[PDB]
Amino acid sequence: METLKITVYIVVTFFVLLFVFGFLSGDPARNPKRKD
Amino acid sequence: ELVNVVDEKLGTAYGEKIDLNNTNIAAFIQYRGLYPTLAKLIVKNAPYESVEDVLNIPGLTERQKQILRENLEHFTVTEVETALVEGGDRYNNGLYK
Amino acid sequence: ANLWERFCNWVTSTDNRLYVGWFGVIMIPTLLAATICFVIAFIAAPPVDIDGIREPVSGSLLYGNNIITGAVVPSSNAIGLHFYPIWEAASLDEWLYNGGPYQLIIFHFLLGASCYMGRQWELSYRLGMRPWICVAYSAPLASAFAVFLIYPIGQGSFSDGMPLGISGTFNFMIVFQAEHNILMHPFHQLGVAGVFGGALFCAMHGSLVTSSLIRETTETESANYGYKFGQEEETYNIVAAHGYFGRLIFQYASFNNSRSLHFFLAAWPVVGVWFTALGISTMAFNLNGFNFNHSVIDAKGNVINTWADIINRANLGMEVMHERNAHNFPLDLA
Amino acid sequence: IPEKLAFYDYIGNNPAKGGLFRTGPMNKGDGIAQAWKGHAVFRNKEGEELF
Amino acid sequence: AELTPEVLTVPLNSEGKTITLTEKQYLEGKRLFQYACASCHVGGITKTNPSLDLRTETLALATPPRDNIEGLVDYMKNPTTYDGEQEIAEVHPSLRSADIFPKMRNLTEKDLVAIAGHILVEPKILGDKWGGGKVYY
Amino acid sequence: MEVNQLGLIATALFVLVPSVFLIILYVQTESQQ
Amino acid sequence: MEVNQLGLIATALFVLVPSVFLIILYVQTESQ
Amino acid sequence: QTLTYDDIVGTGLANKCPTLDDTARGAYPIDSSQTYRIARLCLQPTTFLVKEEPKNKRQEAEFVPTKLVTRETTSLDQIQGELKVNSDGSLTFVEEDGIDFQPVTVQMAGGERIPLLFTVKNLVASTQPNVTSITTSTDFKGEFNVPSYRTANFLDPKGRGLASGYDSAIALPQAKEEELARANVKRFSLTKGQISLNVAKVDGRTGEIAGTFESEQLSDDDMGAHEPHEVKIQGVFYASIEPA
Amino acid sequence: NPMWRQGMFVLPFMARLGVTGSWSGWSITGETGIDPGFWSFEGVALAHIV
Amino acid sequence: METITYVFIFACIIALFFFAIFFREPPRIT
Ligand code: CLA
Ligand code: CLA
Ligand code: CLA
Ligand SMILES: CC(C)=CCC/C(C)=C/CC/C(C)=C\CC/C(C)=C/CC/C(C)=C/CC/C(C)=C\CC/C(C)=C/CC/C(C)=C\CC/C(C)=C/CC1=CC(=O)C(C)=C(C)C1=O
Ligand code: HEC
Ligand SMILES: CC1=C(/C=C/C(C)=C/C=C/C(C)=C/C=C/C=C(C)/C=C/C=C(C)/C=C/C2=C(C)CCCC2(C)C)C(C)(C)CCC1
Ligand code: OEX
Ligand SMILES: [Cl-]
Ligand SMILES: [Cl-]
Fold this sequence. Notes:
Chain I: Belongs to the PsbB/PsbC family. PsbB subfamily. This is part of a larger assembly, with ten protein chains of eight kinds. By secondary structure, chain A is mostly helical.
């Protein structure tokens, strides 16, 4: 059960950093008209 | 061969009088002087061989012996029905209003 | 040309057949987790002791259910609002008896549906649209939060969240009426107004545009072929539509501006469903529908029944029967 | 009392006791009628006729 | 039907004397009963002990009899159990216990009759509804 | 479960026959162009 | 007669399925 | 030095019976002329075994083991009773009261859920004669009552019960009832069980004792519906004695 | 009542090469309460679907 | 056989989903 707990914690943490860092990587600028 | 023991008990004295071996404690409210004190005592010291056995309960004050005598004709005793006394069902049988 | 930057471009690419985005990065895993677990549970879960009284309810197909009676059964009332992942159970067998799969499904679902709404904003920004379609979807999404999370919080248990099932849905809405008189609640009355009104305006708008198609086809072809995808001209005459509906009612109860008309279609069912979702959310804290039981009496003081009292009798028949074994004391206070 | 008459006086032949997906003949439900058992009479312990 | 003085005539004491309230006294008690008592006794039941109710026939069988103004006025001063054997001022509101039950503080003696009388009149109006419970709602 | 045995033939025909109809008309639509 | 009750569904699909195959192929020949 | 509720809440330790130091190998002597009560009897199951049903005759099936699916809800505790000294020096414990039942459901290989009312209700357990001292070789043996798993008010899923509910299969109004008599009429069983309590630890200073137990009883019969299984329970126990 | 009496066709091909237990705790050999790990009858099926 | 029938229809809908999306007639402009 503990191998599972660890795994789920790792999967979740990894997707949430994806998310957070992804929006920090210049999201306002990723549109079609005005980039900045 | 398969009987409902509770229905069958409705066709005894149980179905007409307060059964001192089986009836829920809330019944003793239908006659004056009997609830909560004497009633509590009757349920604790059950079962009884005869209706008159309750006059032998230790701790009775003569006033209490008076009230029971006054009411023995409202009492009966049938055999203990397990379904009716297990579960603490003589103190609370799930019936309210 | 750097690796994170290439990945970031694929994530937000407007060229993927289906758009991912940073919200999609959370939604896809959580919606597959909820979906895969739902499908297996619905088909093959053993029965679940929803009410915490060691009286398990069978919900899956292999255990005697059909499409109409099956459900993934809410988690056990012994758990209340406690978190119950797989890893908190001695074994999968325990997790299944106690209704573990429900918790898994609803949490992943609400998450990914929350990200689903975010994804509606995100892609709108990447195509240069106006942003507010996601506001519209928040009316249904709020409704799902209400029956799967909010109502369980104020009542104290995930066992009174909505079953994931067709008859379990009906069980949920019967019990809600006995306990909250939801029909007599104004916010449910507005949800009906929103949902009847929506269906009416859907038909009205669809019939009125359909009534004013400009002739572009012959009798032997679908008029639908009169429109070509991406044509610059409009495909119906709105002046003629205004001219008809204006006269069916009167001129000023009908729209001549398409923007007000389409915003009207958007707003009406959205608002009404905000309210009915708020109604469920607030009856979670037992602020119930109007009670006029015995509000009318005569000069002697007799009760003179109304239809509210009749409703109440039906409500009572629900109260006294629901979860028939689970109550030991005279009031059902949650 | 002719049996045919008593068989009318039975809710099983009432057409408004059916169900939409309960299929087939009425005989598939309550069975094939065979005989009238008689008219039943209830009395309490006092001897009142009861209905 | 209307609030006649018949229905407003209620026994005063067990001797058998009677007393006839005003409409205004009847409605006085109704008001005071919703203020002090109805949180537990709505409809003439008792939510925290459904076994005892305020039907006149249950009251007549209490010890001492409570089917009358004196017995009711006394019960609100010094409550006992159904058999009369233990004073229960500590757990039932009463003038004797207005320290711990603060709603009973500003009840004058006439307020007590109004309340007692409301209780004896309502069974005459509502029938089995009074003390019957949800079965009769 | 003690279920209706024509349920199965019923469901299969309910599904198959309208479906085959739609397919037959679709495939001959594609064979024109 | 106590016959096998999957016999009906077996005969039915044994007829239906390959017959639909042929009809599908004949009609789309006729329309080209 | 003791623990508090907030140290325990959520641990699982609330379902565990108290333990005795592995030093405690003394003995607690009995004055035949004093009286004694058990203040706390605590019974903690560790193992659940269900007898299989061997289909043929000469096979007498075995006790197979099971999965518990109802969590840490299993232990009996706060049990008190008299501790008599009979004429020949045996001690007899008579249960009075306590939390002496726990519903339990265990799942066998294959899926079958077995519910059972784990209980020591109305327990009388005696020793051998001539005790004079409770020691790490003492055995109590005795028997108890196993009432019905459901009590009289339980309604089955179609509303059928014993002291409440319907007396018939109302969804099948003109179905011949003789088949369903067994499911329509509910029955309140009352069986007996048996228990051995082996003492293996004794604090003679304090009167605490602890050891192992084995009981054998019947599972739920669903108010007549089906036949019960046979259940063997093993675990550990702890009791404290007081001069009455 | 062994598998070959019950019309089981593929159950024996799993048994032939070592798959003998189910996640519900039985084995074809008769032993009750057994931990097969992933590669039970159930798990082999699963993997063929994936 | 009831279980089987229900799952087969559901399965088919999921496959129709698949073709309706990746094998749609592609919309084309003017
Ligand atoms: C003749 C039949 C009839 C009528 C008139 C109504 C009317 C109504 N029902 Mg009712 N209902 C009906 C049949 C009917 N219902 C049936 C058959 C069912 C199923 C059994 C229900 C079930 C039902 C429920 C469950 C609820 C209602 C509700 C409502 C209200 C909202 C309806 C709404 O917004 O719809 C959409 C329609 C529109 C958006 C168009 C406008 C509608 C109004 C009525 C027109 C008013 C015109 C007005 C008088 C102005 C004229 C003068 C002007 C020139 C100045 C409204 C009072 C709700 C309610 O009780 O609210 C109290 C509610 O919760 N109905
Ligand atoms: C004519 C009678 C009538 C009418 C018109 C209504 C109308 C309504 N009722 Mg009432 N109701 C009635 C009688 C009636 N009711 C009666 C008699 C009772 C008592 C027995 C009730 C009890 C009742 C309750 C208890 C509730 C309602 C609710 C509602 C609303 C349901 C729609 C909704 O929530 O949408 C909102 C939209 C959604 C819920 C959709 C969420 C969808 C998510 C976002 C996506 C899901 C994705 C899906 C799983 C996958 C699809 C993908 C696909 C590719 C396969 C609506 C206003 C509900 C409500 O207000 O909920 C807030 C509610 O809980 N009603
Ligand atoms: C008016 C037409 C009619 C009527 C009233 C009857 C009446 C009867 N027939 Mg007969 N029958 C008919 C036409 C009719 N039949 C036809 C056309 C045939 C040839 C197919 C037969 C073949 C036939 C046989 C073989 C048998 C009967 C039998 C019976 C009896 C019981 C039938 C039963 O249980 O129904 C059950 C009815 C239903 C379950 C209702 C089905 C309605 C479906 C659900 C509608 C479909 C909805 C649709 C798809 C929704 C989508 C719409 C939207 C998308 C646009 C009854 C006396 C039986 C009997 O007892 O004989 C002795 C029997 O065995 N009938
Ligand atoms: C003894 C004697 C003799 C007694 C005297 C008795 C006597 C003789 C009496 C007789 C009286 C008499 C002779 C009759 C005259 C009396 C008369 C006035 C009767 C009143 C009748 C009456 C009550 C009528 C009903 C009133 C009523 C329901 C209408 C009010 C308006 C109404 C609700 C309209 C809905 C409007 C709505 C909300 C929005 C539009 C809907 C919608 C969004 C459509 C979409 C849409 C709209 C567009 O617009 C266009 C463009 C397009 C594209 C489009 O998508
Ligand atoms: C709940 C907090 C109560 C409030 C407020 C009031 N009463 Fe009450 N009442 C309550 C209980 C639990 C009981 C039973 C006590 C017992 O064990 O005997 C009662 C009883 C009565 C009775 C006696 C009824 C009988 O059949 O003998 C009466 C007359 C009564 N209560 C009256 C009464 C009045 C007038 C109140 C407001 C002033 C009032 N009660 C408050 C619980 C509660
Ligand atoms: C053989 C057999 C049998 C039968 C069977 C059958 C009848 C079959 C069926 C089958 C089927 C009938 C299948 C199906 C399949 C399907 C699929 C495989 C699907 C797919 C899909 C997809 C892939 C999707 C995708 C997606 C994405 C990706 C994204 C989003 C969208 C979507 C969702 C679309 C039996 C059991 C009797 C017995 C044994 C043997
Ligand atoms: O669980 Mn579901 O349902 Ca809401 O109230 Mn109380 O709890 Mn139960 O009762 Mn009524
Ligand atoms: Cl319910
Ligand atoms: Cl309760």
